[PDB]
């Protein structure tokens, strides 16, 4: 490399740069990090299938969130704190944690609805027509 | 790799040709650690001094002679210089001048001075901050039996959480203790034993909850186990459900007593070895004079 604007008597005018364009062999990280993280993340989808009478849906969702947080802690240790871009697995972890938080909110709402009573809540006719006739038929329930 | 002294102090050339050198040195030296009786362990660290250049027929070591004419065949300790370590006491520090043959061709002799720092851990810090926490955690393992055998009974939750806490304590010990595999620390063995016991508590809680939640509409009551838990152990559709609950409670009680006895015996035997691990009585003079 010769920098034409640099003075001929400057040290920066010339250099020889050797470059190494190296690609990571990802199979180690796929096996040990990505697959467990994805499997534990997709476990949150079981919260909807678990009955509200079980009283463990929030436990599952919050445990998935905790596991995702632990994984994010691990990866943030393995990578520099560069603000240039969010790492791909970091983007996945953030997206997963956001979805898990939304699933916790959904589960809390579902449990609230489940334990509603006519002494404490009013079941509107529109809510009945929506959630007892139309939607369960659409969902093949 | 620091073979030599840390400061090249001046030598003192006394009249009559006597030369004295007393440089200060900080030394980091190999001391194999016997972790078996931790935190009540004592360590036989050693310092081996030799000439890097000259063999035993060129340079010869002897111990300094006290003003009374007694040879100081041990590490000297000066009250004006020595500062006690707050973690390790020093019991003995004998010195021996060893001599060896040279090469296999009967080479010139070799000589080195080995000082055996026999040091002893002051255990009080670890008793308070590690041993007592681990014992208290292990106590909660036995409480799961008293928890109800019915919905809302957190027997398995409590047992697994206490197991996780003991695993965290195991991680703490694994950090403070070397990866050497020559022996297992008795504290680590106690932790492993408590973890195994906790897994057996989980199994027993699962069995108790199974038995208690059985119903005549789905399970045929075993006459042997029913009669045992009803009469033989204590004296050693609602009716069927109540019988199942009573059998579960009797199983909980008997497993509680068995686990308590086993845990107490194991913990006592494990820690007893550490208590017996005093520094041995040795002919050497104490390193620090009373």
């Amino acid at each position: 490399n010769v920098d034409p604007r640099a003075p001929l008597d400057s040290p920066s005018r010339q250099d020889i740069t050797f470059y190494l364009i190296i690609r990571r062999k990802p199979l180690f990280y796929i096996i040990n990090i990505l697959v467990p993280c994805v499997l534990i993340s997709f476990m949150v989808n079981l919260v909807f299938y678990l009955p509200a009478d079980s009283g463990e849906k929030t436990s599952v969702a919050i445990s998935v969130l905790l596991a995702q947080s632990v994984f994010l802690l691990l990866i943030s240790k393995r990578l520099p704190a560069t603000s240039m871009a969010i790492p791909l697995i970091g983007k996945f972890l953030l997206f997963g944690m956001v979805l898990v938080t939304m699933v916790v909110v959904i589960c809390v709402i579902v449990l609230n609805i489940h334990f509603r009573t006519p002494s404490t809540h009013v079941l509107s006719e529109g809510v009945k027509k929506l959630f007892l006739e139309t939607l369960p038929e659409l969902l093949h329930m | 790799g620091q073979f030599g002294v840390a400061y090249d102090a001046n030598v003192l050339v006394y009249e009559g040709g006597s030369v004295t050198w007393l440089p200060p040195a900080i030394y980091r030296s190999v001391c194999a650690v016997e972790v078996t009786y931790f935190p009540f362990d004592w360590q036989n660290c050693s310092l081996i001094f030799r000439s890097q250049t000259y063999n035993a027929e060129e340079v010869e070591f002897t111990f300094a002679v006290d003003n009374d004419g007694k040879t100081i065949n041990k590490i000297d300790i000066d009250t004006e210089a020595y500062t006690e370590n707050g973690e390790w006491a020093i019991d003995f520090c004998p010195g021996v001048i060893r001599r060896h043959h040279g090469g296999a061709t009967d080479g010139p002799g070799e000589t080195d001075v080995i000082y055996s720092l026999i040091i002893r851990r002051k255990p009080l810090f670890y008793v308070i901050n590690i041993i007592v926490p681990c014992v208290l955690i292990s106590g909660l393992v036995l409480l799961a039996y008293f928890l109800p055998a019915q919905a809302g009974g957190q027997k398995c939750t409590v047992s697994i959480n206490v197991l996780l806490a003991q695993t965290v304590f195991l991680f703490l010990i694994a950090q403070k203790i070397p990866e050497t595999s020559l022996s297992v620390p008795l504290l680590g063995r106690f932790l492993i034993f408590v973890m195994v016991v906790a897994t057996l508590i989980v199994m027993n809680c699962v069995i108790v909850l199974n038995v208690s939640q059985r119903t005549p509409t789905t399970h045929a009551m075993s006459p042997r186990l029913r009669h045992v838990l009803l009469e033989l152990l204590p004296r050693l559709t609602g009716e069927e459900v109540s019988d199942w609950v009573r059998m579960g409670n009797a199983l909980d009680n008997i497993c509680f007593w068995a686990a308590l006895v086993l845990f107490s015996v194991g913990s006592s035997l494990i820690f007893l070895g550490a208590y017996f691990n005093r520094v041995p009585d040795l002919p050497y003079a104490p390193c620090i004079q009373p």
Partner: protein, 49 residues
């Protein structure tokens, strides 16, 4: 509501996961070490004087 939220969130989760990881897998270094330079800088491509 549980089953509706399942049918909503599960495909969204799967699609986002697949999108992210596929965008990762397709990443490769360029065929030349310097973009805009046609030379490969490779032992087999000896640029004789």
């Amino acid at each position: 509501v549980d089953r509706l939220c399942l049918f909503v969130v599960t495909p969204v989760m799967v699609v986002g996961t697949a999108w992210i990881f596929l965008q990762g897998v397709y990443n490769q270094p360029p065929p030349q070490p310097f973009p805009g330079d046609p030379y490969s800088y490779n032992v087999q491509d000896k640029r004789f004087i």
